[PDB]
């Protein structure tokens, strides 16, 4: 629900405030690229990236590193 609310806020008031979208997407991306976080934090970070950045930011940022992220987090978690 918070992710949806943030997405709507960013889509609405992103022009009056110039740096809102870059800041939100950058923070979410920085937090996402950290295996030390638990699954909940990573889920929240990916959701925030998708909500704020938009389809283009997702496609151009998350896809290249998915192969590494898989072996990094999913496989260790898949064995649980």
């Amino acid at each position: 629900l918070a992710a949806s609310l943030l997405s709507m806020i960013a889509r609405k008031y992103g022009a009056s405030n110039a740096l809102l979208r870059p800041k939100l997407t950058r923070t979410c991306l920085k937090h996402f690229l950290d295996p030390t976080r638990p699954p909940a934090v990573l889920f929240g970070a990916i959701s925030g990236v998708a909500a704020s950045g938009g389809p283009e930011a997702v496609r151009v940022l998350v896809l290249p590193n998915l192969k590494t992220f898989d072996s990094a987090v999913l496989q260790p978690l898949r064995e649980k």
Binding site: L1, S4, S7, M8
Partner: protein, 523 residues
């Protein structure tokens, strides 16, 4: 004494002592909420439309049903192809009528939907409420929203659970929640919602100060003093200024290119255009009720109707003798009125080339105009010896009120939105507030410098007034001061200043925000 004369005169005269509207509204409300809710919310479109079309067919207005089917087919041509072709009696209709539609929903979503529908009861929500109560039955649930990747769906798919009564009863949630991947109390719930809602109203005002407002200023450079008027479109997307060189210029307030319906001008890149054809200074402009029409009047004695789709003139009205100083559309955009040099007001309709009503009674030139918000009364004011306001009746063309008390040139007029207040300003900086029904001056504001007040505006709820003057100031007034808890009048909330830029126009948007406009002169 005036009372004695009036009494004598009065004694001498023997005076004894349908469904498509609701569908579109619901769609426009559905695409507003969050994407989470939309997945479930969309489920209500098909049953309501189907039942409405079936009722219209059964009611005997087959033409309306055909119009609805042809209109909305494009919105379901990729879902209900077979059903839509069938709708082009069989057992399908009997089965549909016998069994009321089943639609799962969440509790909070149901509460929000009921609140929204109650808010717009008279605007079309009654039809939807009746349809849902009669031909539909919704099974409320305490689960979370149903989405392809929400917690509920993920849990159901992972843990290999079993469907529920609502899930059991052509898109079905089984295809998604299956491995292959309650009821309602309408009517009574509406009474409960109304009772709960009525508890949260504000019924007073004491202590405190006035409301705070913002303001955005649009400035025009390099005019060289050849601008005579200004206007904003009703949605604040275009601005037009009439110059002393007999032409009009239309801009786009966001800078995006303007568009023309002529094929020869396909995707041309310009953000400001010109309208040529007047042969004298232009004194008035009025955007229509987006806007597709525009009016203008000049000193040669002509009124022109332009087009904002092809950018060319369409008609000319030649009912005046001398200059025309003001022009105004009606509150809804079919009637317009114009007044000028020959001390007469006229009311036109765009369907006719001649004035439909002529209104005599003034003794000097006219200098202001206004329309009543219900579009059946007109205000006007004159200058020089006869500085009086009048209120005409569009049906009969006879005056019904006169307001006196001004001692200077009257520059602007404005009628409240509620319809029971009138505000006027003159070149002495005075603003008057009149009670229309009783014809009595309520109060006078003060503070503006000498020179004039070209424009006025009222808040959405008719509790705040904003005026821009030629002394380079913008001021906000409080019509009714707060009740006490036990050169300038004490009801001036704010007063901004501009950097040598007289203000020619002020508008009140939906929010507590306004837009201004002026011409910058370095000297």
């Amino acid at each position: 004494n005036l009372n004695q004369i009036v009494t004598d005169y009065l004694k001498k005269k023997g005076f004894t002592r349908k469904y498509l509207k609701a569908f579109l509204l619901l769609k426009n409300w559905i695409d507003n909420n969050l994407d989470i809710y939309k997945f479930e919310l969309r489920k209500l479109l098909w049953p309501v439309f189907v039942y409405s079309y079936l009722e219209l067919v059964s009611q005997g207005y087959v033409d309306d049903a055909k119009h609805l089917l042809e209109t909305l087919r494009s919105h379901f041509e990729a879902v209900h192809q077979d059903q839509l072709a069938l709708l082009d009696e069989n057992h399908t209709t009997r089965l549909y009528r016998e069994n009321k539609y089943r639609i799962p929903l969440n509790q909070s979503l149901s509460g929000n939907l009921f609140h929204f529908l109650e808010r717009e009861a008279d605007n079309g929500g009654a039809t939807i409420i009746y349809i849902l109560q009669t031909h539909c039955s919704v099974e409320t649930s305490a689960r979370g929203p149903i989405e392809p990747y929400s917690f509920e769906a993920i849990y159901r798919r992972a843990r290999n659970l079993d469907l529920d009564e609502a899930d059991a009863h052509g898109v079905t949630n089984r295809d998604v929640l299956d491995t292959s991947a309650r009821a309602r109390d309408v009517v009574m719930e509406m009474q409960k919602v109304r009772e709960n809602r009525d508890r949260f109203v504000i019924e007073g005002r004491t202590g405190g100060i006035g409301i705070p407002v913002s303001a955005c200023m649009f400035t025009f450079h390099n005019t060289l003093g050849t601008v005579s008027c200004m206007d904003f479109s009703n949605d604040h997307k275009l601005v037009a200024v009439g110059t002393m060189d007999s032409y009009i210029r239309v801009w786009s307030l966001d800078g995006k290119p303007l568009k023309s319906a002529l094929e020869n001008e396909k995707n041309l890149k310009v953000n400001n255009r010109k309208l040529i054809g007047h042969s004298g200074p232009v004194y008035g402009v009025s955007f229509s009720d987006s806007s597709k029409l525009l009016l203008s009047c000049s000193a040669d004695g002509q009124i022109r109707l332009w087009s904002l789709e092809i950018w060319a003139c369409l008609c000319i009205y030649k009912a005046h003798d001398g200059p025309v100083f003001r022009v105004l559309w009606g509150p809804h955009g079919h009637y317009f009125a114009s007044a000028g040099w020959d001390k007469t007001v006229r009311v036109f309709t765009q369907d006719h080339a001649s004035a439909v009503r002529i209104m005599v009674g003034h003794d000097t030139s006219i200098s202001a105009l206004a329309w009543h918000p219900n579009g059946t009364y007109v205000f006007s004011a004159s200058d020089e010896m006869d500085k009086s306001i009048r209120m005409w009746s569009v049906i009969t063309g006879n005056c019904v009120r006169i307001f006196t008390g001004h001692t200077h040139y009257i520059t602007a007029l404005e009628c409240a939105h509620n319809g029971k207040i009138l505000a006027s300003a003159d070149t002495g900086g005075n603003i008057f507030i009149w009670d229309i029904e009783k014809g009595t001056l309520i109060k006078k504001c003060r503070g503006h410098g000498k020179g004039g007040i070209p424009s006025l505006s009222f808040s959405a709820e008719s509790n705040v007034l904003v005026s821009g003057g030629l002394d380079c100031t913008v001021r906000v007034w409080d019509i009714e001061l707060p009740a006490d808890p036990n050169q300038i009048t004490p009801d001036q909330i704010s007063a901004f200043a501009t950097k040598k830029t007289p203000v020619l126009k002020v508008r009140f948007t939906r929010m507590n925000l306004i837009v201004a406009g002026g011409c910058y002169d370095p000297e």
